[PDB]
């Protein structure tokens, strides 16, 4: 009888959505036991009696002094991860007296495919982001072949139209590690390999819906053995008190997810735009970053806006008082804004965020871009006006309503995501081959 090993990626918003799916799987397959592996800090943060969490090593050696490189924690985790997860799984097998029958893992868990092969079990990677970024990873060699790896200077606005479903994607929209950025880094090489091995998975599953882009869906089904859209998850499953008192569609919510803050000059520009427009606001800003706020900003905005280290974001976005979302365009944030019917103001930083920005602005038309890709005072005030007071916002809100309805049908009875989820339950329910 099944024992599903679940290997979480413990940085950014990766472990939470994975746990979210595992909970649905555990309810759907009550006879299967689920062992959820992440770091202790990740597990404490994110946490069905058939699920048990196991803390695995963060990969940091006992006396280690950090160099202070960016994503040094991520490198240390990744290098040790194969062995960290192995030791966790040994523990879980011993506790349950059940061999692992299925390996579910974040697609960023490098070597999960090899671990599953060695154990003789199915590999079911979860892509936590959008099919746009899934597509470009799976086509990394073709993209590199076509564009080259010596840079894109003078070609930033050229179109990725040779890749199915990517006609609106520009060269500059690509993730770091594809054709620009540090192509030789550990993160780049691992991502490169991931893209190459994903076609060998039993099934790749994703928090999205097929009808988001039928051509992209068809293309990915052609590149992968089995490809299963099972979302949007969020349509399946004092901030609020303050919002209660605000006019409909009048509040700007600002957040950059779990690991990103804009640079100090952009923190300033945002504070100036909020002040000059006097737009009511809730700004999720790391407390440490408050040092970058201009003297007097908090005092002058106290009567109409709040700066908090953490907001109940999905609930805020669902609140009738919210009229716009200034976002880094992370995948989970985008779908929560769609659930709430709130137009985006896009300021992507890295990873898949530019692709998501492009999707929002140019494909779905549910948000606006910031001219220059950086916060300026006047640029932000224009976005606030366009969305909150002008016809553009009315159109974006209409686009959001139609998009949400499609998404809702995908997760309804007989929906594409509902049917795909049945397929995935069937896969994780399968005992280990004899
Ligand atoms: O103040 C905050 C900031 C973010 N989030 C949650 O953090 C997640 C951000 O996910 P995303 O994919 O957008 O960005 P990431 O954190 O991975 O960069 C979302 O579920 C947000 O609702 C939140 O609850 N409160």
From Swiss-Prot:
Catalytic site: 14 (proton acceptor), 106 (charge relay)
Pathway: Pigment biosynthesis; anthocyanin biosynthesis
Effect of residue 290 to S: In strain: cv. Flame Muscat, cv. Lambrusco Foglia Frastagliata and cv. Muscat of Alexandria
EC class (word): transferase
Native organism: Vitis vinifera (Grape)
Binding site for quercetin: 12, 71, 137, 175, 351
Keyword entries, A-Z: Glycosyltransferase, Transferase
Cystine pairings recorded for this chain: none
Effect of substituting residue 401 to G: In strain: cv. Pinot noir / PN40024
Free-text function comment from the UniProt entry: In the presence of other necessary color factors, this glycosylation reaction allows the accumulation of anthocyanin pigments. Involved in the formation of red wine pigments. UDP-glucose (UDP-Glc) is the physiological sugar donor, and cyanidin is the natural acceptor in vivo. Can glucosylate the anthocyanidins delphinidin, peonidin, pelargonidin and malvidin. The flavonols quercitin and kaempferol can also be glucosylated in vitro, but with glucosylation rates 50-100 times lower than cyanidin.
Domain of life: Eukaryota
Binding-site list for UDP: 13, 258, 284, 310-311, 328, 332-333, 336
Mutagenesis / variant outcome for changing residue 422 to K: In strain: cv. Flame Muscat, cv. Italia, cv. Lambrusco Foglia Frastagliata, cv. Muscat of Alexandria, cv. Pinot noir, cv. Pinot noir / PN40024, cv. Red Globe and cv. Ruby Okuyama
Record bears the keyword Transferase: yes
Residues binding kaempferol, per UniProt: 12, 14, 71, 137, 175
Record GO biological process: anthocyanin-containing compound biosynthetic process; cyanidin 3-O-glucoside biosynthetic process; quercetin O-glucoside biosynthetic process
The protein's name in its UniProt record: Anthocyanidin 3-O-glucosyltransferase UFGT
Gene of this entry: UFGT
Reactions catalysed, as given in the entry: an anthocyanidin + UDP-alpha-D-glucose + H(+) = an anthocyanidin 3-O-beta-D-glucoside + UDP; cyanidin + UDP-alpha-D-glucose = cyanidin 3-O-beta-D-glucoside + UDP + H(+); delphinidin + UDP-alpha-D-glucose = delphinidin 3-O-beta-D-glucoside + UDP; peonidin + UDP-alpha-D-glucose = peonidin 3-O-beta-D-glucoside + UDP
Activity regulation info: Inhibited by Mn(2+) and Zn(2+).
Additional comment: The expression of UFGT is not detected in white grapes.
Cross-referenced InterPro entries: UDP_glucos_trans, UDP_glycos_trans_CS
Any one Gene Ontology molecular-function term assigned to this protein's record: flavonol 3-O-glucosyltransferase activity
Residues reported to bind UDP-alpha-D-glucose: 13, 128, 258, 284, 310-311, 328, 331-333, 336, 352-353
EC annotation from Swiss-Prot or TrEMBL: 2.4.1.115, 2.4.1.91
Induction description: By light.
